[PDB]
């Protein structure tokens, strides 16, 4: 089909977090049917970033999700035309991120155009002081409302001390054409920074994601 077992990734993010503007471009690759992908990211404008890179990494495509055959695949069905998604992340100390992404496909590459705004992060909290270590593994609840697919995650952002910062993810995923809608189900995630230089001007992100039914 149009989604090959190996797909490349090209993306641009335009960002502004607590007034700091930046642009990040990435190139990557993954295996959509295995639910795994990696992206190499470079800050093209606004280097060095004065905040935790972890608030960006989940913005850097649920086409990369292993789905069992008894759950309709909202994301893969949407191609070649693709889909967009919109997300709010509400942080424990009142920081908020709003993210929008448009996912298209050109030959054997997915293309993402991302806008991300972060605001109200405490100047001395762990995001702006770069005291995060990464995301915990998570489970996203996927459910259909208003003819589109929604995802909710009660997430934890892990902190350098060993504690954690609760972050609530709400996402709306919007196919650009009609598709068969799934029932309520889960998507388990693991996301990791595999490499970064000292300032996180260069970063490689890895994510795995598997869908499963609600009972199991």
């Amino acid at each position: 089909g149009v989604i090959k077992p190996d797909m490349k990734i090209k993306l641009k993010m335009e960002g502004n977090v607590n007034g700091h503007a930046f642009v990040i471009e990435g190139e990557g690759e993954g295996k959509p049917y295995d639910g795994t992908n990696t992206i190499n990211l470079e800050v093209k404008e606004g280097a060095p970033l004065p905040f935790s890179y972890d608030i960006l990494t989940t913005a850097f495509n649920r086409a990369f999700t292993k789905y069992p055959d008894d759950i309709p695949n909202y994301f893969k069905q949407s191609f070649p035309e693709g889909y967009s998604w919109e997300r709010t992340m509400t942080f424990e100390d009142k920081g908020i991120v709003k993210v929008k992404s448009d996912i298209s496909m050109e030959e054997d590459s997915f293309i993402y155009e991302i806008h991300l705004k972060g605001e109200n992060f405490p100047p001395n909290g762990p995001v702006m002081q770069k005291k995060t270590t990464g995301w915990d593994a998570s489970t996203e609840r996927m459910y259909v409302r208003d003819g589109v697919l929604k995802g909710d995650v009660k997430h934890k952002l892990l902190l350098e001390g060993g504690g954690h910062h609760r972050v609530d993810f709400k996402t709306i995923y919007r196919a650009k054409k009609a598709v068969k809608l799934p029932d309520y189900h889960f998507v388990d995630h693991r996301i990791e920074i595999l490499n970064h230089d000292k300032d996180y001007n260069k970063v490689t992100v890895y994510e795995s994601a598997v869908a499963r039914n609600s009972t199991d």
């Binding site: 335009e14 503007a21 404008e45 919109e86 709010t88 709003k98 806008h115 208003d146």
Partner: protein
């Protein structure tokens, strides 16, 4: 309620349902409905290229200069996508030709970056600031160059030279 139809209006504009849109507006739908990322019906129609819905929304009171949470205006979006006719009706309806989004980009920055020469020309004709700088100090000329849009870069360079001869 204006609000609850406003939400159906957002959906109709996003899906391209010119008739739905018109039906919903006749029945009182809030033309300035917004969603959780600050998109209005006008933003959505401008991005999708639904010219007829753009016109209808403008005639019935839509805010031509609404900004979404990223500082993006309908004119940014039409310029980004190359919707020349929508760029023209937005400008005629009062769109701020020099609005800046959250990274400092004007509609001219986007037209230059995404290679839409006719939009570049309309925007300059309507007073777009050819020397506008984004938050990184880049001009529309710099973006044209970075993306290999030399014809646009030539147009911008000429307009910048000529602009040095005002009073």
């Amino acid at each position: 309620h204006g609000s609850d139809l406003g939400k159906k209006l957002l959906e109709a504009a996003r899906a391209g349902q010119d008739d739905e849109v018109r039906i919903l507006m006749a029945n009182g739908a809030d033309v300035n409905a917004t969603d959780w990322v600050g998109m209005t019906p006008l933003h959505l129609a401008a991005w999708k290229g639904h010219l007829e819905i753009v016109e209808v929304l403008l005639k019935t009171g839509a805010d031509v200069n609404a900004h979404d949470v990223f500082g993006t205006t309908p004119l940014h979006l039409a310029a980004h996508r190359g919707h020349l006719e929508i760029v023209e009706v937005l400008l005629k309806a009062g769109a701020d030709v020099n609005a800046q989004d959250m990274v400092g980009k004007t509609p001219l920055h986007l037209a230059a970056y995404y290679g839409h020469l006719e939009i570049v020309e309309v925007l300059l004709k309507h007073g777009a600031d050819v020397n506008a700088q984004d938050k990184f100090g880049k001009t529309p000329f710099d973006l044209a160059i970075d993306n290999g849009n030399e014809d646009i870069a030539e147009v911008l360079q000429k307009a910048a030279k000529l602009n040095d001869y005002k009073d």
